[PDB]
Design a binder for these strands. Sequence first.
DNA 1: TGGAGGGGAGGAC
DNA 2: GTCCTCCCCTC
Length: 515
Amino acid sequence: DPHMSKFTWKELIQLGSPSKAYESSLACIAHIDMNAFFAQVEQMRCGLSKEDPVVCVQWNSIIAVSYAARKYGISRMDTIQEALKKCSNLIPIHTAVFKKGEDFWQYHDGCGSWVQDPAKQISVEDHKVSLEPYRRESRKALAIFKWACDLVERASIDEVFLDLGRICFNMLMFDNEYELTGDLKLKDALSNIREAFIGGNYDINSHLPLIPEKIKSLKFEGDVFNPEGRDLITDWDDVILALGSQVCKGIRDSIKDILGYTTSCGLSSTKNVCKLASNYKKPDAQTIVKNDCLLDFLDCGKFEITSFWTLGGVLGKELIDVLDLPHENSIKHIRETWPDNAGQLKEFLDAKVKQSDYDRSTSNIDPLKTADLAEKLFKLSRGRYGLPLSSRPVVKSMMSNKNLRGKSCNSIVDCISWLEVFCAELTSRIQDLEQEYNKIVIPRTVSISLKTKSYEVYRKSGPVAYKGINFQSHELLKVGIKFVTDLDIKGKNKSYYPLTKLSMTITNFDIIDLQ
DNA sequence: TGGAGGGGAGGAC
DNA sequence: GTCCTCCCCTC
Ligand SMILES: Nc1ccn([C@H]2C[C@H](O)[C@@H](COP(=O)(O)OP(=O)(O)OP(=O)(O)O)O2)c(=O)n1
Ligand SMILES: [Mg+2]
Ligand SMILES: [Mg+2]
Protein backbone atom coordinates (compact mmCIF):
# COMPACT_ATOMS: atom_id res chain seq x y z
CA ASP A 1 0.00 0.00 0.00
CA PRO A 2 1.74 3.21 -1.23
CA HIS A 3 -0.55 5.27 1.00
CA MET A 4 1.35 3.88 4.06
CA SER A 5 4.91 3.49 5.32
CA LYS A 6 6.88 0.46 4.18
CA PHE A 7 7.34 -0.42 7.87
CA THR A 8 5.12 -1.89 10.58
CA TRP A 9 4.54 -1.24 14.24
CA LYS A 10 6.23 -4.57 14.90
CA GLU A 11 9.46 -3.41 13.25
CA LEU A 12 9.42 -0.15 15.24
CA ILE A 13 8.58 -1.73 18.59
CA GLN A 14 11.30 -4.33 18.12
CA LEU A 15 13.96 -1.56 18.24
CA GLY A 16 13.29 -1.66 22.01
CA SER A 17 14.39 -5.30 22.22
CA PRO A 18 18.16 -5.90 22.50
CA SER A 19 17.71 -9.49 21.30
CA LYS A 20 15.59 -8.65 18.19
CA ALA A 21 16.39 -5.01 17.23
CA TYR A 22 19.01 -6.10 14.67
CA GLU A 23 16.47 -8.07 12.55
CA SER A 24 14.26 -5.02 12.02
CA SER A 25 14.49 -3.28 8.69
CA LEU A 26 14.40 -0.07 10.88
CA ALA A 27 17.59 -1.17 12.74
CA CYS A 28 20.14 1.52 13.48
CA ILE A 29 23.66 0.14 13.81
CA ALA A 30 26.96 2.03 14.14
CA HIS A 31 30.46 0.77 13.42
CA ILE A 32 33.09 2.95 15.07
CA ASP A 33 36.75 2.63 14.18
CA MET A 34 39.62 4.53 15.86
CA ASN A 35 41.62 6.59 13.36
CA ALA A 36 45.29 5.48 13.07
CA PHE A 37 44.85 3.82 16.40
CA PHE A 38 48.35 2.79 17.56
CA ALA A 39 49.77 6.10 16.26
CA GLN A 40 47.08 8.05 18.19
CA VAL A 41 47.88 6.07 21.38
CA GLU A 42 51.57 7.00 21.01
CA GLN A 43 50.69 10.63 20.21
CA MET A 44 48.67 10.88 23.43
CA ARG A 45 51.28 9.03 25.49
CA CYS A 46 54.00 11.44 24.27
CA GLY A 47 51.95 14.67 24.63
CA LEU A 48 52.03 15.30 20.88
CA SER A 49 49.42 16.96 18.67
CA LYS A 50 47.27 15.88 15.67
CA GLU A 51 49.74 17.87 13.49
CA ASP A 52 52.83 15.82 14.50
CA PRO A 53 53.73 13.12 11.91
CA VAL A 54 53.84 10.10 14.22
CA VAL A 55 54.28 6.54 13.09
CA CYS A 56 54.16 3.45 15.27
CA VAL A 57 57.04 1.10 14.46
CA GLN A 58 57.39 -2.64 15.07
CA TRP A 59 60.93 -3.84 14.34
CA ASN A 60 61.49 -2.20 10.92
CA SER A 61 57.81 -1.98 9.83
CA ILE A 62 55.40 0.90 10.22
CA ILE A 63 52.28 -0.63 11.68
CA ALA A 64 50.27 2.57 12.15
CA VAL A 65 50.49 5.92 10.39
CA SER A 66 49.05 9.15 11.90
CA TYR A 67 46.92 11.26 9.55
CA ALA A 68 49.64 13.95 9.71
CA ALA A 69 52.22 11.44 8.35
CA ARG A 70 49.79 10.25 5.68
CA LYS A 71 50.00 13.73 4.10
CA TYR A 72 53.58 12.79 3.15
CA GLY A 73 52.45 9.62 1.37
CA ILE A 74 53.51 7.24 4.19
CA SER A 75 51.56 3.92 4.27
CA ARG A 76 51.16 1.03 6.75
CA MET A 77 53.83 -1.54 6.07
CA ASP A 78 56.28 1.01 4.67
CA THR A 79 59.67 0.28 6.21
CA ILE A 80 61.00 2.90 8.58
CA GLN A 81 63.75 3.81 6.05
CA GLU A 82 61.15 4.24 3.28
CA ALA A 83 59.09 6.53 5.55
CA LEU A 84 62.11 8.64 6.48
CA LYS A 85 62.72 9.30 2.77
CA LYS A 86 59.17 10.75 2.52
CA CYS A 87 59.17 12.98 5.64
CA SER A 88 62.14 14.79 7.16
CA ASN A 89 60.38 15.58 10.46
CA LEU A 90 58.96 12.06 11.01
CA ILE A 91 58.40 10.96 14.62
CA PRO A 92 58.82 7.16 14.66
CA ILE A 93 57.90 5.55 17.97
CA HIS A 94 58.65 1.89 18.58
CA THR A 95 56.16 -0.33 20.40
CA ALA A 96 56.86 -1.15 24.01
CA VAL A 97 58.96 -4.32 24.48
CA PHE A 98 59.96 -7.04 26.97
CA LYS A 99 63.67 -7.88 27.17
CA LYS A 100 64.54 -11.57 27.16
CA GLY A 101 65.44 -12.41 30.76
CA GLU A 102 63.16 -9.75 32.28
CA ASP A 103 59.52 -10.01 33.39
CA PHE A 104 58.08 -6.54 32.67
CA TRP A 105 57.57 -4.47 29.52
CA GLN A 106 58.62 -0.88 28.92
CA TYR A 107 59.05 1.77 26.26
CA HIS A 108 62.56 2.63 25.10
CA ASP A 109 61.89 6.06 23.63
CA GLY A 110 64.69 7.40 21.47
CA CYS A 111 65.52 3.81 20.44
CA GLY A 112 65.04 1.80 17.24
CA SER A 113 66.67 0.66 13.99
CA TRP A 114 66.62 4.22 12.58
CA VAL A 115 68.89 5.46 15.42
CA GLN A 116 72.63 5.65 14.54
CA ASP A 117 73.80 4.97 18.12
CA PRO A 118 74.29 1.20 18.78
CA ALA A 119 73.56 1.90 22.48
CA LYS A 120 70.00 2.92 21.47
CA GLN A 121 69.00 -0.15 19.46
CA ILE A 122 66.01 -2.45 20.11
CA SER A 123 67.27 -5.78 18.90
CA VAL A 124 64.88 -8.37 17.42
CA GLU A 125 67.20 -11.03 18.87
CA ASP A 126 66.57 -10.20 22.54
CA HIS A 127 63.15 -8.50 22.76
CA LYS A 128 59.45 -9.25 22.23
CA VAL A 129 56.65 -6.75 21.49
CA SER A 130 54.10 -5.62 24.09
CA LEU A 131 50.78 -4.46 22.65
CA GLU A 132 49.48 -3.78 26.17
CA PRO A 133 49.42 0.02 25.86
CA TYR A 134 47.04 -0.35 22.91
CA ARG A 135 44.94 -3.02 24.71
CA ARG A 136 44.61 -0.75 27.77
CA GLU A 137 43.37 2.18 25.71
CA SER A 138 40.99 -0.14 23.84
CA ARG A 139 39.45 -1.24 27.18
CA LYS A 140 39.10 2.42 28.26
CA ALA A 141 37.23 3.18 25.02
CA LEU A 142 35.03 0.07 25.50
CA ALA A 143 33.99 1.32 28.97
CA ILE A 144 32.87 4.64 27.42
CA PHE A 145 30.92 2.93 24.65
CA LYS A 146 29.15 0.64 27.14
CA TRP A 147 28.28 3.59 29.40
CA ALA A 148 26.60 5.23 26.40
CA CYS A 149 24.92 2.19 24.78
CA ASP A 150 23.30 -1.01 26.13
CA LEU A 151 24.65 -3.29 23.37
CA VAL A 152 28.23 -2.96 22.22
CA GLU A 153 30.33 -5.59 20.38
CA ARG A 154 34.11 -5.21 20.38
CA ALA A 155 34.97 -6.46 16.89
CA SER A 156 38.76 -5.92 17.06
CA ILE A 157 41.31 -3.91 19.07
CA ASP A 158 40.02 -0.58 17.66
CA GLU A 159 36.50 -1.36 16.33
CA VAL A 160 33.07 -1.61 17.94
CA PHE A 161 29.56 -2.10 16.74
CA LEU A 162 26.74 -0.35 18.62
CA ASP A 163 23.03 -1.18 18.43
CA LEU A 164 21.39 2.23 18.83
CA GLY A 165 17.86 0.77 18.81
CA ARG A 166 16.82 1.65 22.37
CA ILE A 167 18.31 5.12 22.17
CA CYS A 168 16.59 5.85 18.82
CA PHE A 169 13.29 4.34 19.94
CA ASN A 170 13.30 6.28 23.17
CA MET A 171 14.21 9.55 21.49
CA LEU A 172 11.50 9.03 18.87
CA MET A 173 8.80 8.35 21.44
CA PHE A 174 9.72 10.13 24.69
CA ASP A 175 12.19 12.97 24.07
CA ASN A 176 10.38 16.21 24.83
CA GLU A 177 13.38 18.55 24.64
CA TYR A 178 14.91 17.85 21.21
CA GLU A 179 14.45 20.79 18.87
CA LEU A 180 14.23 20.40 15.10
CA THR A 181 14.15 24.17 14.56
CA GLY A 182 13.84 27.28 16.71
CA ASP A 183 10.08 27.01 16.22
CA LEU A 184 9.54 23.21 16.20
CA LYS A 185 10.23 20.44 18.70
CA LEU A 186 10.53 16.74 17.88
CA LYS A 187 7.53 16.10 20.21
CA ASP A 188 5.29 18.32 18.07
CA ALA A 189 6.57 17.01 14.74
CA LEU A 190 5.77 13.49 15.95
CA SER A 191 2.45 14.21 17.66
CA ASN A 192 0.50 11.64 15.55
CA ILE A 193 2.83 8.67 16.13
CA ARG A 194 3.29 9.48 19.83
CA GLU A 195 -0.47 9.80 20.32
CA ALA A 196 -0.92 6.36 18.73
CA PHE A 197 1.87 4.79 20.72
CA ILE A 198 0.75 6.19 24.10
CA GLY A 199 -2.90 5.56 23.20
CA GLY A 200 -1.91 1.97 22.66
CA ASN A 201 -4.59 1.19 20.12
CA TYR A 202 -2.36 -0.03 17.21
CA ASP A 203 -2.14 -3.57 15.81
CA ILE A 204 1.45 -4.79 15.84
CA ASN A 205 1.05 -6.15 12.28
CA SER A 206 -0.29 -2.88 10.81
CA HIS A 207 1.86 -0.54 8.77
CA LEU A 208 2.89 2.74 10.29
CA PRO A 209 1.29 5.95 8.99
CA LEU A 210 3.21 7.83 6.29
CA ILE A 211 5.72 10.15 7.97
CA PRO A 212 4.45 13.64 8.85
CA GLU A 213 5.79 16.50 6.67
CA LYS A 214 7.17 18.21 9.81
CA ILE A 215 9.71 15.47 10.55
CA LYS A 216 11.52 16.32 7.28
CA SER A 217 13.10 19.22 9.24
CA LEU A 218 15.08 16.66 11.21
CA LYS A 219 18.80 16.77 10.24
CA PHE A 220 21.34 14.04 9.78
CA GLU A 221 24.64 14.70 11.58
CA GLY A 222 27.55 13.70 9.34
CA ASP A 223 28.08 12.87 5.68
CA VAL A 224 25.01 11.36 4.03
CA PHE A 225 26.14 9.13 1.13
CA ASN A 226 23.88 10.42 -1.62
CA PRO A 227 25.41 10.74 -5.12
CA GLU A 228 21.97 10.60 -6.76
CA GLY A 229 20.61 13.46 -4.63
CA ARG A 230 17.72 11.42 -3.19
CA ASP A 231 15.29 13.05 -0.73
CA LEU A 232 16.82 12.81 2.75
CA ILE A 233 13.81 11.89 4.91
CA THR A 234 11.07 9.86 3.20
CA ASP A 235 10.06 7.12 5.68
CA TRP A 236 10.54 6.06 9.27
CA ASP A 237 13.85 4.33 8.62
CA ASP A 238 15.33 7.73 7.71
CA VAL A 239 13.90 9.28 10.87
CA ILE A 240 15.46 6.58 13.07
CA LEU A 241 18.79 6.79 11.22
CA ALA A 242 18.90 10.61 11.53
CA LEU A 243 18.25 10.41 15.31
CA GLY A 244 20.91 7.72 15.52
CA SER A 245 23.41 9.97 13.70
CA GLN A 246 22.80 12.66 16.34
CA VAL A 247 23.41 10.16 19.17
CA CYS A 248 26.49 8.62 17.55
CA LYS A 249 28.15 12.04 17.16
CA GLY A 250 27.66 12.65 20.91
CA ILE A 251 29.21 9.24 21.72
CA ARG A 252 32.15 9.89 19.40
CA ASP A 253 32.63 13.33 21.03
CA SER A 254 32.80 11.57 24.44
CA ILE A 255 35.62 9.37 23.14
CA LYS A 256 37.39 12.41 21.75
CA ASP A 257 36.95 14.60 24.87
CA ILE A 258 37.79 11.91 27.44
CA LEU A 259 40.51 9.92 25.65
CA GLY A 260 41.65 12.26 22.89
CA TYR A 261 40.92 9.85 19.99
CA THR A 262 39.34 10.68 16.66
CA THR A 263 37.12 8.05 15.08
CA SER A 264 35.42 7.28 11.81
CA CYS A 265 31.89 5.84 11.90
CA GLY A 266 29.43 4.16 9.61
CA LEU A 267 25.71 4.28 10.25
CA SER A 268 23.17 2.08 8.52
CA SER A 269 20.62 -0.68 9.13
CA THR A 270 23.23 -3.46 9.10
CA LYS A 271 26.63 -4.42 10.52
CA ASN A 272 28.13 -5.22 7.12
CA VAL A 273 27.18 -1.88 5.58
CA CYS A 274 28.29 0.02 8.73
CA LYS A 275 31.76 -1.54 8.49
CA LEU A 276 32.17 -0.48 4.84
CA ALA A 277 30.80 3.00 5.59
CA SER A 278 33.18 3.62 8.54
CA ASN A 279 36.10 3.11 6.16
CA TYR A 280 34.64 5.37 3.41
CA LYS A 281 35.82 8.66 4.92
CA LYS A 282 38.65 9.24 7.35
CA PRO A 283 39.69 10.79 9.65
CA ASP A 284 37.09 12.18 12.07
CA ALA A 285 33.96 11.54 9.99
CA GLN A 286 30.59 9.79 10.11
CA THR A 287 29.23 8.25 6.85
CA ILE A 288 25.50 7.51 6.82
CA VAL A 289 24.01 5.06 4.34
CA LYS A 290 20.23 5.33 3.98
CA ASN A 291 18.26 2.25 2.95
CA ASP A 292 17.32 3.98 -0.32
CA CYS A 293 21.05 4.63 -0.99
CA LEU A 294 22.28 1.08 -0.29
CA LEU A 295 22.62 0.06 -3.92
CA ASP A 296 24.22 3.43 -4.84
CA PHE A 297 26.79 2.75 -2.05
CA LEU A 298 27.47 -0.92 -2.73
CA ASP A 299 27.80 -0.29 -6.46
CA CYS A 300 30.02 2.85 -6.21
CA GLY A 301 32.97 0.83 -7.52
CA LYS A 302 34.93 0.45 -4.27
CA PHE A 303 33.43 -2.88 -3.31
CA GLU A 304 33.16 -6.48 -4.46
CA ILE A 305 31.50 -9.51 -2.86
CA THR A 306 34.87 -10.27 -1.30
CA SER A 307 34.68 -6.95 0.58
CA PHE A 308 32.19 -8.45 3.04
CA TRP A 309 33.17 -10.02 6.37
CA THR A 310 33.65 -13.81 5.95
CA LEU A 311 34.11 -13.51 2.20
CA GLY A 312 37.64 -12.08 2.05
CA GLY A 313 39.46 -15.42 1.91
CA VAL A 314 39.14 -18.90 0.46
CA LEU A 315 35.33 -19.19 0.65
CA GLY A 316 34.98 -15.88 -1.23
CA LYS A 317 37.32 -17.15 -3.96
CA GLU A 318 35.42 -20.43 -4.26
CA LEU A 319 32.15 -18.44 -4.64
CA ILE A 320 33.70 -16.36 -7.40
CA ASP A 321 34.36 -19.67 -9.23
CA VAL A 322 31.13 -21.51 -8.33
CA LEU A 323 28.86 -18.54 -9.18
CA ASP A 324 30.88 -17.45 -12.25
CA LEU A 325 31.20 -13.93 -10.83
CA PRO A 326 32.91 -11.22 -12.88
CA HIS A 327 36.15 -9.62 -11.70
CA GLU A 328 34.42 -6.26 -11.13
CA ASN A 329 30.86 -5.25 -10.16
CA SER A 330 30.30 -8.69 -8.61
CA ILE A 331 27.80 -7.30 -6.10
CA LYS A 332 25.49 -5.96 -8.80
CA HIS A 333 26.03 -9.17 -10.74
CA ILE A 334 24.73 -11.30 -7.84
CA ARG A 335 21.76 -8.97 -7.42
CA GLU A 336 20.76 -8.94 -11.09
CA THR A 337 21.47 -12.61 -11.89
CA TRP A 338 19.11 -13.80 -9.04
CA PRO A 339 16.84 -10.78 -8.96
CA ASP A 340 13.62 -11.97 -7.24
CA ASN A 341 14.41 -14.20 -4.29
CA ALA A 342 17.15 -16.22 -2.61
CA GLY A 343 15.51 -19.50 -3.73
CA GLN A 344 16.78 -18.65 -7.26
CA LEU A 345 20.33 -18.62 -5.99
CA LYS A 346 19.76 -21.68 -3.77
CA GLU A 347 18.59 -23.72 -6.81
CA PHE A 348 21.76 -22.68 -8.67
CA LEU A 349 23.95 -23.65 -5.68
CA ASP A 350 22.25 -26.99 -5.08
CA ALA A 351 22.92 -27.98 -8.72
CA LYS A 352 26.63 -27.04 -8.43
CA VAL A 353 27.16 -29.03 -5.22
CA LYS A 354 25.05 -32.05 -6.26
CA GLN A 355 27.48 -32.79 -9.09
CA SER A 356 29.63 -35.91 -8.47
CA ASP A 357 32.32 -33.53 -9.82
CA TYR A 358 32.08 -31.33 -6.67
CA ASP A 359 34.72 -32.06 -3.97
CA ARG A 360 33.09 -31.78 -0.53
CA SER A 361 36.40 -32.47 1.29
CA THR A 362 38.16 -29.40 -0.22
CA SER A 363 35.09 -27.07 -0.48
CA ASN A 364 34.18 -24.47 2.13
CA ILE A 365 30.53 -24.54 1.08
CA ASP A 366 28.33 -26.69 3.32
CA PRO A 367 26.01 -28.60 0.95
CA LEU A 368 23.44 -28.98 3.74
CA LYS A 369 23.36 -25.24 4.37
CA THR A 370 22.78 -23.82 0.89
CA ALA A 371 19.53 -22.08 1.98
CA ASP A 372 21.56 -20.05 4.50
CA LEU A 373 24.32 -19.24 2.00
CA ALA A 374 21.87 -18.21 -0.71
CA GLU A 375 19.96 -15.92 1.69
CA LYS A 376 23.22 -14.42 2.96
CA LEU A 377 24.51 -13.60 -0.54
CA PHE A 378 21.07 -12.43 -1.70
CA LYS A 379 20.73 -10.02 1.23
CA LEU A 380 24.39 -8.88 1.37
CA SER A 381 24.15 -7.86 -2.30
CA ARG A 382 21.25 -5.59 -1.34
CA GLY A 383 22.71 -4.24 1.92
CA ARG A 384 20.04 -5.97 3.97
CA TYR A 385 21.85 -8.84 5.71
CA GLY A 386 21.21 -8.30 9.46
CA LEU A 387 23.61 -10.02 11.85
CA PRO A 388 23.24 -9.77 15.63
CA LEU A 389 25.79 -8.01 17.85
CA SER A 390 27.55 -10.51 20.24
CA SER A 391 28.93 -8.61 23.29
CA ARG A 392 31.89 -10.62 24.46
CA PRO A 393 33.22 -11.90 27.80
CA VAL A 394 36.07 -9.97 29.41
CA VAL A 395 38.47 -12.27 27.56
CA LYS A 396 38.31 -15.41 25.46
CA SER A 397 41.94 -16.13 24.56
CA MET A 398 45.34 -14.64 25.12
CA MET A 399 48.50 -15.15 23.00
CA SER A 400 52.16 -14.27 23.44
CA ASN A 401 54.23 -14.71 20.26
CA LYS A 402 57.81 -14.35 19.06
CA ASN A 403 58.97 -14.90 15.49
CA LEU A 404 62.66 -15.79 15.85
CA ARG A 405 65.60 -14.61 13.73
CA GLY A 406 69.02 -16.25 13.25
CA LYS A 407 69.95 -18.59 16.13
CA SER A 408 68.03 -16.74 18.90
CA CYS A 409 66.16 -20.02 19.65
CA ASN A 410 68.74 -22.73 19.00
CA SER A 411 67.97 -25.25 21.75
CA ILE A 412 65.46 -26.20 24.42
CA VAL A 413 67.15 -23.82 26.86
CA ASP A 414 66.44 -20.90 24.51
CA CYS A 415 62.81 -22.05 24.14
CA ILE A 416 62.36 -22.00 27.88
CA SER A 417 63.93 -18.53 28.15
CA TRP A 418 61.25 -17.21 25.77
CA LEU A 419 58.49 -19.17 27.56
CA GLU A 420 59.52 -17.35 30.75
CA VAL A 421 58.84 -14.02 29.02
CA PHE A 422 55.48 -15.30 27.68
CA CYS A 423 54.40 -16.50 31.13
CA ALA A 424 55.37 -13.19 32.80
CA GLU A 425 53.43 -11.29 30.11
CA LEU A 426 50.27 -13.42 30.25
CA THR A 427 50.18 -13.37 34.10
CA SER A 428 50.45 -9.58 34.13
CA ARG A 429 47.62 -9.31 31.58
CA ILE A 430 45.43 -11.63 33.68
CA GLN A 431 46.13 -9.69 36.86
CA ASP A 432 45.20 -6.38 35.15
CA LEU A 433 41.88 -7.84 33.91
CA GLU A 434 41.06 -9.14 37.43
CA GLN A 435 41.62 -5.66 38.96
CA GLU A 436 39.87 -3.75 36.19
CA TYR A 437 36.73 -5.87 35.96
CA ASN A 438 36.57 -7.33 39.53
CA LYS A 439 36.76 -10.96 38.36
CA ILE A 440 38.72 -14.13 38.90
CA VAL A 441 40.23 -15.06 35.55
CA ILE A 442 41.37 -18.68 35.37
CA PRO A 443 43.31 -20.18 32.47
CA ARG A 444 42.07 -23.73 31.74
CA THR A 445 43.80 -24.72 28.48
CA VAL A 446 47.16 -23.77 26.94
CA SER A 447 48.51 -24.27 23.43
CA ILE A 448 52.14 -24.12 22.37
CA SER A 449 52.76 -23.59 18.69
CA LEU A 450 56.17 -23.39 17.02
CA LYS A 451 57.85 -23.38 13.63
CA THR A 452 61.15 -25.11 12.83
CA LYS A 453 64.05 -23.85 10.70
CA SER A 454 62.20 -25.45 7.73
CA TYR A 455 58.96 -23.65 8.70
CA GLU A 456 57.20 -26.89 9.71
CA VAL A 457 54.50 -26.29 12.38
CA TYR A 458 54.40 -28.26 15.66
CA ARG A 459 51.52 -27.80 18.13
CA LYS A 460 50.43 -29.15 21.45
CA SER A 461 47.56 -28.15 23.74
CA GLY A 462 46.16 -29.38 27.05
CA PRO A 463 44.97 -28.44 30.49
CA VAL A 464 46.73 -26.05 32.87
CA ALA A 465 46.20 -26.33 36.64
CA TYR A 466 45.01 -23.38 38.75
CA LYS A 467 46.48 -22.36 42.14
CA GLY A 468 45.72 -18.62 42.30
CA ILE A 469 47.24 -15.54 40.70
CA ASN A 470 50.45 -15.76 42.81
CA PHE A 471 51.29 -19.13 41.21
CA GLN A 472 49.81 -18.49 37.76
CA SER A 473 53.08 -17.84 35.96
CA HIS A 474 54.56 -21.06 37.43
CA GLU A 475 51.51 -23.11 36.41
CA LEU A 476 51.71 -21.80 32.85
CA LEU A 477 55.48 -22.44 32.63
CA LYS A 478 55.11 -26.01 33.90
CA VAL A 479 52.84 -26.85 30.95
CA GLY A 480 54.90 -24.83 28.47
CA ILE A 481 58.06 -26.74 29.38
CA LYS A 482 56.26 -30.07 29.18
CA PHE A 483 54.90 -29.22 25.71
CA VAL A 484 58.18 -27.82 24.27
CA THR A 485 60.14 -30.90 25.40
CA ASP A 486 57.36 -33.20 24.01
CA LEU A 487 57.63 -31.44 20.65
CA ASP A 488 61.43 -31.57 20.72
CA ILE A 489 61.11 -35.37 20.94
CA LYS A 490 58.55 -35.32 18.09
CA GLY A 491 61.11 -33.37 16.00
CA LYS A 492 63.95 -35.91 16.52
CA ASN A 493 65.89 -36.72 13.30
CA LYS A 494 64.01 -33.93 11.50
CA SER A 495 64.89 -30.34 10.64
CA TYR A 496 64.11 -28.45 13.90
CA TYR A 497 66.46 -25.95 15.61
CA PRO A 498 66.91 -23.11 15.24
CA LEU A 499 63.21 -22.30 15.53
CA THR A 500 61.60 -19.58 13.43
CA LYS A 501 58.58 -19.02 15.75
CA LEU A 502 57.38 -19.91 19.24
CA SER A 503 54.07 -18.88 20.83
CA MET A 504 51.95 -19.66 23.88
CA THR A 505 48.15 -19.14 23.87
CA ILE A 506 45.69 -19.52 26.74
CA THR A 507 42.80 -20.75 24.58
CA ASN A 508 40.09 -21.28 27.26
CA PHE A 509 39.43 -19.32 30.48
CA ASP A 510 36.93 -19.57 33.36
CA ILE A 511 35.63 -16.17 34.48
CA ILE A 512 34.18 -15.72 38.00
CA ASP A 513 32.08 -12.71 38.94
CA LEU A 514 32.72 -11.11 42.32
CA GLN A 515 30.64 -8.73 44.46
C1' DT B 1 54.89 -8.53 8.74
C1' DG B 2 54.38 -9.83 13.20
C1' DG B 3 51.67 -10.21 16.60
C1' DA B 4 47.59 -10.41 17.69
C1' DG B 5 41.93 -12.14 18.58
C1' DG B 6 37.72 -14.92 16.93
C1' DG B 7 35.55 -19.16 15.48
C1' DG B 8 34.54 -24.04 14.09
C1' DA B 9 35.00 -29.11 11.93
C1' DG B 10 35.85 -33.52 12.93
C1' DG B 11 38.66 -37.37 14.37
C1' DA B 12 40.81 -38.82 18.78
C1' DC B 13 39.98 -40.13 23.18
C1' DG C 1 30.21 -36.79 25.85
C1' DT C 2 34.75 -33.45 25.77
C1' DC C 3 39.52 -32.65 23.94
C1' DC C 4 43.07 -31.96 20.50
C1' DT C 5 44.66 -30.72 16.06
C1' DC C 6 44.21 -28.24 12.12
C1' DC C 7 42.14 -24.87 9.40
C1' DC C 8 39.67 -20.47 8.17
C1' DC C 9 38.02 -15.55 9.53
C1' DT C 10 39.67 -10.71 10.86
C1' DC C 11 42.79 -6.34 12.60
N1 LIG D 1 47.35 -6.13 9.98
C1 LIG D 1 47.27 -5.25 10.99
C2 LIG D 1 46.28 -4.27 10.95
C3 LIG D 1 46.19 -3.36 12.00
N2 LIG D 1 47.05 -3.41 13.02
C4 LIG D 1 46.94 -2.49 14.17
C5 LIG D 1 47.48 -1.11 13.93
C6 LIG D 1 46.23 -0.28 13.78
O1 LIG D 1 46.45 1.04 14.26
C7 LIG D 1 45.14 -1.02 14.56
C8 LIG D 1 43.74 -0.83 14.00
O2 LIG D 1 43.69 -1.17 12.60
P1 LIG D 1 42.93 -0.35 11.46
O3 LIG D 1 42.93 -1.22 10.26
O4 LIG D 1 41.68 0.28 11.99
O5 LIG D 1 44.02 0.80 11.09
P2 LIG D 1 44.22 2.21 11.80
O6 LIG D 1 43.34 2.49 12.97
O7 LIG D 1 45.71 2.32 12.07
O8 LIG D 1 43.94 3.24 10.58
P3 LIG D 1 42.49 3.80 10.11
O9 LIG D 1 42.45 5.25 10.49
O10 LIG D 1 42.60 3.55 8.64
O11 LIG D 1 41.50 2.97 10.89
O12 LIG D 1 45.55 -2.40 14.52
C9 LIG D 1 48.06 -4.39 13.02
O13 LIG D 1 48.87 -4.40 13.97
N3 LIG D 1 48.14 -5.29 12.02
MG1 LIG E 1 41.30 2.15 12.82
MG1 LIG F 1 39.84 -2.09 11.90
